[PDB]
Amino acid sequence: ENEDVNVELSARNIPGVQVTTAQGLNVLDITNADSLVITEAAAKKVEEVLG
Amino acid sequence: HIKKGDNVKVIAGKDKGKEGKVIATLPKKDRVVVEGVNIMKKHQKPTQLNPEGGILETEAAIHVSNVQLLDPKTNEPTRVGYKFVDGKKVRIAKKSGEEIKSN
RNA sequence: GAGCUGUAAGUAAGCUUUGAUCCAGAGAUUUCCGAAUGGGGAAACCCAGCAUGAGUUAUGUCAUGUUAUCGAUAUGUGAAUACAUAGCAUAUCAGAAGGCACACCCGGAGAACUGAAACAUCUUAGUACCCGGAGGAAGAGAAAGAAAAUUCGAUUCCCUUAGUAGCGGCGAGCGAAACGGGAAGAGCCCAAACCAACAAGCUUGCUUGUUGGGGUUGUAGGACACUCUAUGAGUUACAAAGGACGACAUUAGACGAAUCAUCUGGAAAGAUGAAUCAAAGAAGGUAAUAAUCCUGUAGUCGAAAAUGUUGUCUCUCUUGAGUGGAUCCUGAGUACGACGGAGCACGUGAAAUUCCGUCGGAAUCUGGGAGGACCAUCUCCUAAGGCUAAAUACUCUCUAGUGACCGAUAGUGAACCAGUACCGUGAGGGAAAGGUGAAAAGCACCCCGGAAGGGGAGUGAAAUAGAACCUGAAACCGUGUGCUUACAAGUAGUCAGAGCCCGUUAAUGGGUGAUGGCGUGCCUUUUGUAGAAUGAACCGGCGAGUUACGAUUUGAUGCAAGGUU
RNA sequence: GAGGGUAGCGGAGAAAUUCCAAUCGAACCUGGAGAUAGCUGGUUCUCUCCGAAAUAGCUUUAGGGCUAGCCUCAAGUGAUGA
RNA sequence: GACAAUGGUAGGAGAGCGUUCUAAGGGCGUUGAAGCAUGAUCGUAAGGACAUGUGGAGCGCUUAGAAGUGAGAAUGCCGGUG
RNA sequence: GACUCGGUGAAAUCAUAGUACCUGUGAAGAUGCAGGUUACCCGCGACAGGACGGAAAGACCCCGUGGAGCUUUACUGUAGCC
Ligand SMILES: [Mg+2]
Ligand SMILES: [Mg+2]
Ligand SMILES: [Mg+2]
Ligand SMILES: [Mg+2]
Ligand SMILES: [Mg+2]
Ligand SMILES: [Mg+2]
Ligand SMILES: [Mg+2]
Ligand SMILES: [Mg+2]
Ligand SMILES: [Mg+2]
Ligand SMILES: [Mg+2]
Ligand SMILES: [Mg+2]
Ligand SMILES: [Mg+2]
Ligand SMILES: [Mg+2]
Ligand SMILES: [Mg+2]
Ligand SMILES: [Mg+2]
Ligand SMILES: [Mg+2]
Ligand SMILES: [Mg+2]
Ligand SMILES: [Mg+2]
Ligand SMILES: [Mg+2]
Ligand SMILES: [Mg+2]
Ligand SMILES: [Mg+2]
Ligand SMILES: [Mg+2]
Ligand SMILES: [Mg+2]
Ligand SMILES: [Mg+2]
Ligand SMILES: [Mg+2]
Ligand SMILES: [Mg+2]
Ligand SMILES: [Mg+2]
Ligand SMILES: [Mg+2]
Ligand SMILES: [Mg+2]
Ligand SMILES: [Mg+2]
Ligand SMILES: [Mg+2]
Ligand SMILES: [Mg+2]
């Protein structure tokens, strides 16, 4: 949603995983990936900030 | 990072899997030499030392990273990690047995 | 933490657990020329003096100190002249000189080529060269300002104002500013009146010259009188200066997790299968392409020493607020004006503000300036004395990095013992030249030859990889060959077609050609070219509409009387 | 023959435009500097569609330029063109 | 199935192959990669393949970007050979 | 010296070349074109009529709104001097 002391610091070794804070949502990776898995706390925010 | 009085087992060479001892290490070329491993025959001519010198058969140098120092309590090759106890640093063979294989 | 004695193999003696060689901090050594400085001088040399000392019976020699010029500080001495001053003689001092990356800055001095389609005012441009002085940043700077509403407030820099107001042989072309949005935010010390000593004239008076202390601004501050406050703030970059008490950053280095087996192979890191760590799947090396073989990375620690930031205390320092303004002071040859001139975006014009040269030349708080000449009224602010951090401009280097940047005719000129060979008297020009293999295993031996080379043998997966060394294309010079040529007129082909030889990415097959038709190469340049017009000896390699900023246009895509940073 | 002096806007000359590091109507070496050039030469891969002019006016202009004229895509107007 | 049109310079307008690098996806590589030589094959052009030798290690193909992108002439430059 | 044999061995030039003459046509003077005529392949020794032969991006002439040096009662300036 805004930070992760571990999720930003786990998953940094595996090939094919990106861990991005919801205000750093660019457009290349979100169509480079094939599968959005988001927390339920940021999902309510992205409509409250893009619409 | 081996020493001059160890007894090791190679991994990848022309003769792999053979044991043996180390007699020199050459720590600027980092290529070590083992008895009975990779004979390289020389055509030495008649010199002022060898009276009518000729062919011979002497093992010569190979790299460090084809050579792994094996566990003395198990005889299976092993990475060596280091830790230090009291004043100096000793070699644990990372199979829970520290070796004594210097001399 | 076990080998080392440079690049650099070979030696031959040696060093090394009693801790070498290397890595970091600190100290001793530091010959000689160089600003060269004891005098000379062709830079790397020559000749001395002065004290001490070695030495010889002395003379010759040697050794370490010592003596340049300005400048300063102290005595000596002191002329033409008698009083003193230049002058002269000794002793201390280390102040200067030279060099710098001269990249960036500040002042002194300062061209032309070119554009105007020529050229003189203008512009190229106050640009390049030259010289002077400093710094890690210099300059600017605390309103004699901007402004016109309601005012806000030191300087610098970025975006817009805007290619607008304007300047101009009104041509080419130059070209602002404030308001606004931000970056980063400190303001202060002297001069004077007056007062307290000191000295002098020359007396208990005055004047003058020092020393403190007092004091430094315009809503007018200060002197002088009135009354009331003090061991609480401020600081070693501005404001006055030095230094002990105590957290980090640099200059070496530690630890650092995870794998096997088969196959082809000279050798696996590859293929197939079975596993494992992961805050570690950055990167390179290892006989091919490795997260788990090595050096490493993520994350953690270390610092005898010596510097840099610095937090704290310790020290220096230090009284600050109000009123009366009935008197006294507020930066003199200054501001201004006349005369020629430079700068202000502004070419002397209607020309303010700004500095220099020559010459005349004010008033002082009822003052003095400035609001694009000047006068009047109204608003603003107090020159002729000083000091100043941050925002910002630069890299010859140092540390750690990154790149739709080059991969040896590219990249720096310079990957290679490069500003070197080499050319020039000189100042100065200025090249070419990378690759054996995994490892030197660098061909023992046999044979011809004086040797160089060569054929065998031999190492190696490969020597058709032999130290002119990976790969080896074209020009070009050669070797036996299948068809074809000695009665022939030729930009060399093409289209018919006989005979003889070979059999394909198997298709209306490939090579050769006795004989017939048809016919003057290519590019630039031209009214026109085979042209006797130009250009090319041939084969490789290199070698010519690009980028930033804008303006206008169609094509695209958002939004719609709204779009946009 | 040996030492020495005069340096480019300059020097030397029994004067010729002679001499100044195989030269000179103003030496050489860097830097402004990729000066400017209305002038020559050069400009690299292929195929489809359409395809001119060498004239007029004015110029320190006649081998250069600007505008009209003649071609080309794109929109329109659409019966004006032969 | 028609129907017409297709010489061509300066020049204007479209559709295209190839070279180097990056991004993503998907592959081939010691049972032999890129280049090099040879061949009677395929596309309308530029060009694309496929076997066989030599070669010893890093390349293609589709999509989409960015440009130091193509050679026969400059009395071109450099190195070779006549 | 040239010439023959033994030694060593360059250069300017050069689009490719198996390179005949006549009359004519042509950018108006042809080894290459039309029409004839005459000639087997191959080298050495000489001669100089051609190949508008080589050597120098014609100095002569004429152009450029190109530069230089010189002159004068050209224009505008300036060191000096009264
Ligand atoms: Mg050695
Ligand atoms: Mg000296
Ligand atoms: Mg003595
Ligand atoms: Mg701020
Ligand atoms: Mg380790
Ligand atoms: Mg490890
Ligand atoms: Mg004036
Ligand atoms: Mg090469
Ligand atoms: Mg060399
Ligand atoms: Mg063998
Ligand atoms: Mg060949
Ligand atoms: Mg004929
Ligand atoms: Mg023409
Ligand atoms: Mg000819
Ligand atoms: Mg020629
Ligand atoms: Mg004459
Ligand atoms: Mg003479
Ligand atoms: Mg030039
Ligand atoms: Mg210029
Ligand atoms: Mg046509
Ligand atoms: Mg056509
Ligand atoms: Mg076009
Ligand atoms: Mg390639
Ligand atoms: Mg060529
Ligand atoms: Mg020539
Ligand atoms: Mg002869
Ligand atoms: Mg001869
Ligand atoms: Mg004729
Ligand atoms: Mg004739
Ligand atoms: Mg002859
Ligand atoms: Mg002759
Ligand atoms: Mg000419």
From Swiss-Prot, chain A:
Part of the 50S ribosomal subunit. This is Large ribosomal subunit protein uL4. The chain holds residues 157 to 207 of 207 of the full protein. One of the primary rRNA binding proteins, this protein initially binds near the 5'-end of the 23S rRNA. It is important during the early stages of 50S assembly. It makes multiple contacts with different domains of the 23S rRNA in the assembled 50S subunit and ribosome. Forms part of the polypeptide exit tunnel. Belongs to the universal ribosomal protein uL4 family. The gene is rplD.
Curated annotation (Swiss-Prot), chain B:
Keywords: Ribonucleoprotein, Ribosomal protein, RNA-binding, rRNA-binding. CDD domains: KOW_RPL26 (cd06089). GO terms for cellular component: cytosolic large ribosomal subunit. InterPro entries: KOW, Rib_uL2_dom2, Ribosomal_uL24, Ribosomal_uL24_CS, Ribosomal_uL24_KOW, Translation_prot_SH3-like_sf. PANTHER family: MITOCHONDRIAL RIBOSOMAL PROTEIN L24 (PTHR12903). Belongs to the universal ribosomal protein uL24 family. Part of the 50S ribosomal subunit. This is Large ribosomal subunit protein uL24. The lineage of its organism: Bacteria, Bacillati, Bacillota, Bacilli, Bacillales.
